C-alpha cells in the first residue's frame, strides 16, 4: 500500500515532533566530584563514596 | 464643515483640507476646477441637503498632481480550451487638495 500523494514537509515534520530525545539523570559523587549516571557506577569506578572497581 | 461633491461619475465626502484621488480631469497642475455638483453641506449642526443640489454650487479646489495608479493585471484563461490572454492596466488619477467648495 502506497501513497497517492507525497507527504508535505509540514506533515513530514509533524510526525517527528515526538522524536526529540530525553536527557539522562546525572548526578555528582560527593567524594570525587565527578558526574555520572544516577544509580550507576562512576566512569572511574566509584559508587556512593567508595571505590568498587 | 464637510461637503459631498460629484467629480468622476461618483461622489466623495470631502473635508476642508483633504488630499484625495479622483478620476482624471482635464486640467493642469496648480490650477482650479469647476463642477457645480455639491450635494450636501454640513457645518457643525447646520446641515444643508441638496433639493437636487445645494444651490450656489461650485467645485473649485486646487490640483496637487496628475498621477497613475498601481498596475492591476488581467488574466483570461479557459482551461482545456487552449486560450490564454493577459493585459496590464494603470488607472489615471488627479490628486486634488480641497480649498473651495460651494
Amino acid at each position: 500500500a502506497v501513497q497517492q500523494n507525497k507527504k508535505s514537509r509540514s506533515a513530514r515534520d509533524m510526525r517527528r515532533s515526538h522524536d526529540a530525545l530525553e536527557s539522562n539523570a546525572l548526578s555528582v559523587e560527593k567524594s570525587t566530584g565527578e558526574v555520572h549516571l544516577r544509580h550507576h557506577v562512576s566512569p572511574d569506578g566509584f559508587y556512593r563514596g567508595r571505590k568498587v572497581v | 464643515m464637510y461637503a459631498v461633491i460629484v467629480t468622476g461619475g461618483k461622489q466623495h465626502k470631502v473635508t476642508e483640507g483633504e488630499f484625495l484621488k479622483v478620476e482624471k480631469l482635464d486640467v493642469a497642475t496648480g490650477e482650479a476646477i469647476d463642477f457645480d455638483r455639491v450635494l450636501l453641506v454640513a457645518n457643525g449642526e447646520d446641515v444643508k441637503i441638496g433639493l437636487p443640489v445645494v444651490e450656489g454650487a461650485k467645485v473649485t479646489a486646487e490640483v496637487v498632481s496628475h498621477g497613475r495608479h498601481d498596475k492591476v493585471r488581467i488574466i483570461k484563461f479557459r482551461r482545456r480550451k487552449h486560450h490564454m490572454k493577459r493585459q496590464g492596466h494603470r488607472q489615471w488619477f488627479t490628486e486634488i487638495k480641497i480649498t473651495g467648495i460651494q
Partner: protein, 48 residues
C-alpha cells in the same frame, strides 16, 4: 546610405511565423493542422 541604414519597403519581407511556439502566437499546439486524421500526421498527404 549606411550599411546600418538599409531596409526594404514594407511588404517586401515578412516575418515567417513559426508554428507551435506557445498558445499566444496563434499557431499554438497544433500549428494550423487541427486534430486527428491523416492531414495532421507527418507525411500526412492525400495523393493528387
Amino acid at each position: 546610405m549606411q550599411l546600418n541604414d538599409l531596409r526594404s519597403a514594407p511588404g517586401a519581407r515578412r516575418e515567417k511565423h513559426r508554428p507551435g511556439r506557445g498558445i499566444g502566437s496563434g499557431l499554438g499546439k497544433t500549428g494550423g493542422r487541427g486534430h486527428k486524421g491523416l492531414t495532421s500526421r507527418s507525411g500526412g498527404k492525400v495523393a493528387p
